[PDB]
Structure 1
């Protein structure tokens, strides 16, 4: 299991500011919870050669670090050391409720971003909770109050295809092979295509974005600590959204 690819020491070096006084997530996102959650997701950081497995862990930690970042350009240790600072979306302007018989909503509950992937929407709390055997639809704040559940929501997101979108897993491990349509659309395997799965609509195929550069900075720093190459196609500026 991934414990022997990423030690407690490596995890704490990567996420070295998450326990800062100014981080609302201080003490929450533990190495023990990450390792436990990973055991619940067969193939996570155990798919492919050693370099691919480390790139998967760096890609997952890089994208989730961006979603939760407390960084700023002049921050101590630089902006790519401030991952996992936040638990909950800042200043949500919606309840993130899209009602259906398929995807119900709970009275008074708000499905704003929580945990490492900033899991949002009644439908994702619903599907994820079903997959991990916890009722997140009626207890969505468990994603911000239970660290193993928190990580499982992010790993669930990472590991779960949402057609037409492949899983971030299948992309970063090279299991995903682009279709004729993807090729024509400039959608190519690598870290960029994980940005496309995560927030392509707002971030991809529209040229340079500060948010995409932030995603890449975390990924490169974590790859550097693992002593692995980044692979190719790190940005999605020239990829059509899935």
Structure 2
């Protein structure tokens, strides 16, 4: 179980300020919910040598910390201590409903960002819910009211390949082998390629971006706390985005 590799103390040290009065998700994101969710995803934080398992947990908590960050440059303990500050997308101006024979939008329900990966759109809530065994198409706000389901949605995203994207899991553990195509595109194994899978269309292949800097700051601080090296290729600044 990953509970040996990441203790309650280490988890609370990494996510130091998530329960500060200013954070809307205060009290929601629990160590027990993270550990219970990880059990549902064999291989998560249990793949590779100890250093690689810690890099995987740091990378998962890093990327999710970015998606939910309340950080700012002069934040107490730095901006990479303010992961998991929010739960629901701020001021959504869409239902995130998209034409689909397979994933009909449920009446009165919205598919705005929820939980540690800010899961969005009926066509993501559908296959995610199917995968974890919950009807998230018809009960989307479970991602913001059930903290085990919340973490499961983010682990579903992390562990699930989506052609032509490999899984973040396979990238960070070194299971993923770049294609000749990938190598020409500058898509090399490491933390950078997890950013590319998450939001490469907007964030990768356009040089320095404060968003990608933020994803890296979290990953580095968590690796520092775990006492493991970052590995290589942390940015995607020269990576062509993975396809959709």
**Matched residue of 1:101: which SS?**
coil
**Matched residue of 1:124: which SS?**
helix
Per-residue displacement from partner, 1:132-176 (whole Å, max 9, x unpaired)? Answer: 111111110100000000000000000000000000000000100
Question: Which stretches of structure 1, 4 residues or more, deviate above 4 A after TM superposition?
Answer: none
Distance 2:106 2:153 in 1: 18
Distance 1:65 1:29 in 2: 11
Per-residue displacement from partner, 1:96-147 (whole Å, max 9, x unpaired)? Answer: 1112112221122111110000001101111111111111111101000000
**Matched residue of 1:153: which SS?**
helix
**Shift, 1:203, TM fit:** 0.1
User: Runs of 5+ in structure 1 lacking a partner?
Assistant: none
Per-residue displacement from partner, 1:191-233 (whole Å, max 9, x unpaired)? Answer: 0000000000000001110000000000000000000000000
* TM-score, with structure 1 as normaliser: 0.99
Q: 2:195 aligns to what?
A: 195
- Decide whether the 8 Å contact of 2:34 with 2:151 is kept in 1: yes
Distance 1:205 1:139 in 2: 36
Q: 2:138 aligns to what?
A: 138
- Decide whether the 8 Å contact of 2:203 with 2:211 is kept in 1: yes
**Matched residue of 2:3: which SS?**
helix
Distance 1:145 1:103 in 2: 22
Q: 1:36 aligns to what?
A: 36
Q: 2:152 aligns to what?
A: 152
- Decide whether the 8 Å contact of 2:3 with 2:35 is kept in 1: yes
Greater shift after overlay, 222-231 or 85-94? 85-94
Distance 2:95 2:208 in 1: 30
Per-residue displacement from partner, 1:36-85 (whole Å, max 9, x unpaired)? Answer: 00000010000111100000000000000000001110111110000000
User: Runs of 5+ in structure 2 lacking a partner?
Assistant: none
Distance 1:37 1:220 in 2: 24
Distance 2:181 2:23 in 1: 42
**Matched residue of 1:218: which SS?**
helix
Per-residue displacement from partner, 1:23-42 (whole Å, max 9, x unpaired)? Answer: 11111000000000000001
**Shift, 1:93, TM fit:** 2.4
**Matched residue of 2:52: which SS?**
helix
- Decide whether the 8 Å contact of 2:103 with 2:137 is kept in 1: no
Paired residues, what number?
Answer: 242
- Decide whether the 8 Å contact of 2:158 with 2:168 is kept in 1: yes
Distance 1:189 1:78 in 2: 28
* TM-score, with structure 2 as normaliser: 0.98
Compute the RMSD of aligned alpha carbons. Answer: 0.6
Say whether residues 1:241 and 2:221 are aligned partners: no
